[PDB]
Amino acid sequence: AAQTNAPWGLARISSTSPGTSTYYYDESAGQGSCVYVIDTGIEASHPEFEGRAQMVKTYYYSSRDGNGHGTHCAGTVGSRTYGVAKKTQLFGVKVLDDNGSGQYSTIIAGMDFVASDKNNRNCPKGVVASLSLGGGYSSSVNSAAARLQSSGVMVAVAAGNNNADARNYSPASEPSVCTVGASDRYDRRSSFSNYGSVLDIFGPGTDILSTWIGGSTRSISGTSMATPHVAGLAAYLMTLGKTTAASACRYIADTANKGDLSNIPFGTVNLLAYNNYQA
Ligand SMILES: [Ca+2]
Q: Is residue 91 part of a domain?
A: yes
Phi, psi of 229 (to 5 degrees): -60, -45
- All residues at 6 or more sequence positions from 169 whose CB lies less than 8 Å from its CB, including other chains: 134, 135, 136, 137, 159, 160, 162, 194
Query: Are the C-beta atoms of residues 201 and 273 closer than 8 Å to each other?
Result: yes
Residue 224 appears among annotated catalytic residues: yes
Distance 258 CA to ligand 1 centre (A): 17
**Cβ(191)–Cβ(95) below 8 Å:** no
> Residue 211: which of 95, 11, 76, 39 has the closest Cα?
76
Instruction: Give Cα 12 distance to the centre of its chain.
Output: 15
From 33, 65, 69, 165, active-site residue:
69
Please give the tally of structural domains in the chain.
Answer: 1
The answer on whether 254 is annotated among ligand-binding residues is: no
179 CB-side CA count, 13 A: 29
* Nearest-angstrom CA–CA distance, 163 and 145: 23
Judged by phi (left if over 0) then psi (alpha if -120 to 50, else beta), residue 99 lies in: alpha
Q: Find the helix packing angle between 223-239 and 69-78, rounded to 10°.
A: 30
In a domain, 137, yes or no: yes
β-sheet bridge partners, residue 157: 131, 179
Q: What is the DSSP string of 84-128?
A: SSTT-EEEEEE-S-TTS---HHHHHHHHHHHHHHGGGS--TTEEE
Query: Rounded distance, CA 275 to CA 262, Å?
Result: 21
Cα distance from N-terminal residue to C-terminal residue, the chain: 7
Helix (H) or strand (E) holding 136: strand 135-136
148 lies in some domain: yes
Judged on CB neighbours under 10 Å (0-12, 13-18, 19+), 39 is: buried
Q: Does the residue 278 lie in any domain? A: no
d(CA 112, CA 119): 12
Task: Examine residue 275 and state whether it is found in any structural domain, yes or no.
Answer: no
Resolution, expressed in angstroms to one decimal: 1.0
**Is 72 considered catalytic here?**
no
Residue 175 sits in a domain whose CATH number is 3.40.50.200
Distances (CA, A) of 186 to 8, 189, 194, 199, 279: 10, 9, 18, 20, 24
49 with 212: CB under 8 angstroms? no
100 CA distance to ligand 1 middle (Å): 25
* Cα 124 from chain centre: 20
Q: Cα separation of 170 and 175, whole Å?
A: 11
Omega before residue 171 within 30° of 0, cis: yes
Q: Is 46 a catalytic residue?
A: no
In a domain, 272, yes or no: no
Selection from 271, 135, 108 nearest residue 199 by Cα: 271
In a domain, 69, yes or no: yes
User: DSSP string covering 14-74, please?
Assistant: T-SSSS---EE--TTTTTTEEEEEEES---TTSGGGTT-EEEEEESSS--S-SSSHHHHHH
Sign for the CA dihedral angle at 224, 228, 234, 235 comes to positive
Of the candidates 219, 208, 222, 202, the one whose C-alpha atom is nearest the C-alpha of residue 273 is 202
**Residues of the domain holding 63:** 2-255
3-state SS class at 7: coil
Q: Which experiment gave this structure?
A: X-ray
Domain contains 261 = no
Residue 172 CA to ligand 1 center (angstroms) comes to 9
Q: Which of 80, 75, 82, 81 is nearest to 35 (CA)?
A: 75
Determine which one of 39, 65, 97, 165 is catalytic. Answer: 39
What distance in Å separates the CA atoms of residue 176 and residue 197, rounded to the nearest whole number?
Answer: 13
Consult the annotation and say whether 177 binds a ligand: yes
What span, in angstroms and rounded, lies between the C-alpha atoms of 38 and 269? Answer: 26
